[PDB]
């Protein structure tokens, strides 16, 4: 079995812009979620081969993870904060679609999501 290519993190054709909100997403939001005790399953793309989940990429067609998000932030991939917020949302929603409501991995995602939303409440206004 095989994993798909990861989500795009480099594209010289895509216009880029640094914004105070993007800087906050890296320096506050991502950094805080990354250090959380439940972050580890989310720090890299799901390796469906290693985890013996052959159905994963049949069910999840818009994959996303914090490793990818970290690279997109550090390598200035984004034009705006909404693109980055959408990536986090995709990551959470994927987890909830693929797994069962009770599952440990779901409780971990929910903890991270609660935290994420608290941090998004302090998103600075655009300079
Ligand atoms: C994220 C995500 N979304 O769907 C799946 C499935 C994962 C996932 C990713 C991993 O890297 C490891 C594990 C699994 O071994 C685990 C981790 C923690 C608790 N309970 C189970 C699950």
UniProtKB/Swiss-Prot annotation:
Swiss-Prot/TrEMBL puts the cross-link Glycyl lysine isopeptide (Lys-Gly) (interchain with G-Cter in SUMO2) at 58
What does its PTM field state?
Answer: Phosphorylation by CK2 disrupt the intramolecular binding between the bromo domain 2 and the NPS region and promotes binding between the NPS and the BID regions, leading to activate the protein and promote binding to acetylated histones. In absence of phosphorylation, BRD4 does not localize to p53/TP53 target gene promoters, phosphorylation promoting recruitment to p53/TP53 target promoters.
Coiled-coil annotated residue ranges, if any: none
Q: Which domain of life is it from?
A: Eukaryota
- Cleaved signal peptide residues: none
Site Acetylated histone binding: which residues?
99
Q: In which tissues is it expressed?
A: Ubiquitously expressed.
Q: Where in the cell is it found?
A: Nucleus; Chromosome
Q: Where is the Bromo domain?
A: 17-123
Q: Main role?
A: Chromatin reader protein that recognizes and binds acetylated histones and plays a key role in transmission of epigenetic memory across cell divisions and transcription regulation. Remains associated with acetylated chromatin throughout the entire cell cycle and provides epigenetic memory for postmitotic G1 gene transcription by preserving acetylated chromatin status and maintaining high-order chromatin structure. During interphase, plays a key role in regulating the transcription of signal-inducible genes by associating with the P-TEFb complex and recruiting it to promoters.
Tell me more from the record.
JQ1, a thieno-triazolo-1,4-diazepine derivative, and I-BET, a benzodiazepine derivative, have been tested on tumors with success. Treatment with GSK1210151A (I-BET151, a I-BET derivative) has strong effets on mixed lineage leukemia and promotes myeloid differentiation and leukemia stem-cell depletion.
The family note in this entry says: Belongs to the BET family.
Q: Which disease is it linked to?
A: Cornelia de Lange syndrome 6: A form of Cornelia de Lange syndrome, a clinically heterogeneous developmental disorder associated with malformations affecting multiple systems. It is characterized by facial dysmorphisms, abnormal hands and feet, growth delay, cognitive retardation, hirsutism, gastroesophageal dysfunction and cardiac, ophthalmologic and genitourinary anomalies. CDLS6 inheritance is autosomal dominant.
Q: How does the record describe its quaternary structure?
A: Interacts with p53/TP53; the interaction is direct. Interacts (via CTD region) with CDK9 and CCNT1, acting as an associated component of P-TEFb complex. Interacts with RELA (when acetylated at 'Lys-310'). Interacts (via NET domain) with NSD3, CHD4, BICRA and ATAD5. The interaction with BICRA bridges BRD4 to the GBAF complex. Interacts (via NET domain) with JMJD6 (via JmjC and N-terminal domains); the interaction is stronger in presence of ssRNA and recruits JMJD6 on distal enhancers. Interacts with NSD3. Interacts with NIPBL. (Microbial infection) Interacts with bovine papillomavirus type 1 regulatory protein E2. This interactions may serve for the tethering of viral genomes to host mitotic chromosomes allowing successful partitioning of the viral genome during cell division.
Notes concerning its domains: The NET domain mediates interaction with a number of chromatin proteins involved in transcription regulation (NSD3, JMJD6, CHD4, GLTSCR1 and ATAD5). The C-terminal (CTD) region mediates interaction and recruitment of CDK9 and CCNT1 subunits of the P-TEFb complex. It is also required for maintenance of higher-order chromatin structure.
* Protein name per its UniProtKB record: Bromodomain-containing protein 4
Q: Organism, per UniProt?
A: Homo sapiens (Human)
The uppermost taxa in this organism's lineage are:
Eukaryota, Metazoa, Chordata, Craniata, Vertebrata
């Amino acid at each position: 079995s095989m994993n798909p290519p990861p989500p795009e993190t480099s594209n010289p054709n895509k216009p880029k812009r640094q914004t105070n909100q993007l800087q906050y997403l890296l320096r506050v939001v991502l950094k805080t979620l990354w250090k959380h005790q439940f972050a580890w399953p989310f720090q890299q793309p799901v390796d469906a081969v290693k985890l013996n989940l052959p159905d994963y990429y049949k069910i999840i067609k818009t994959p996303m993870d914090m490793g990818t998000i970290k690279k997109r932030l550090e390598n200035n991939y984004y034009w705006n904060a909404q693109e980055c917020i959408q990536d986090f949302n995709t990551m959470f929603t994927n987890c909830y679609i693929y797994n069962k409501p009770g599952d440990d991995i779901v409780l971990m995602a929910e903890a991270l999501e609660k935290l994420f939303l608290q941090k998004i409440n302090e998103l600075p206004t655009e300079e």
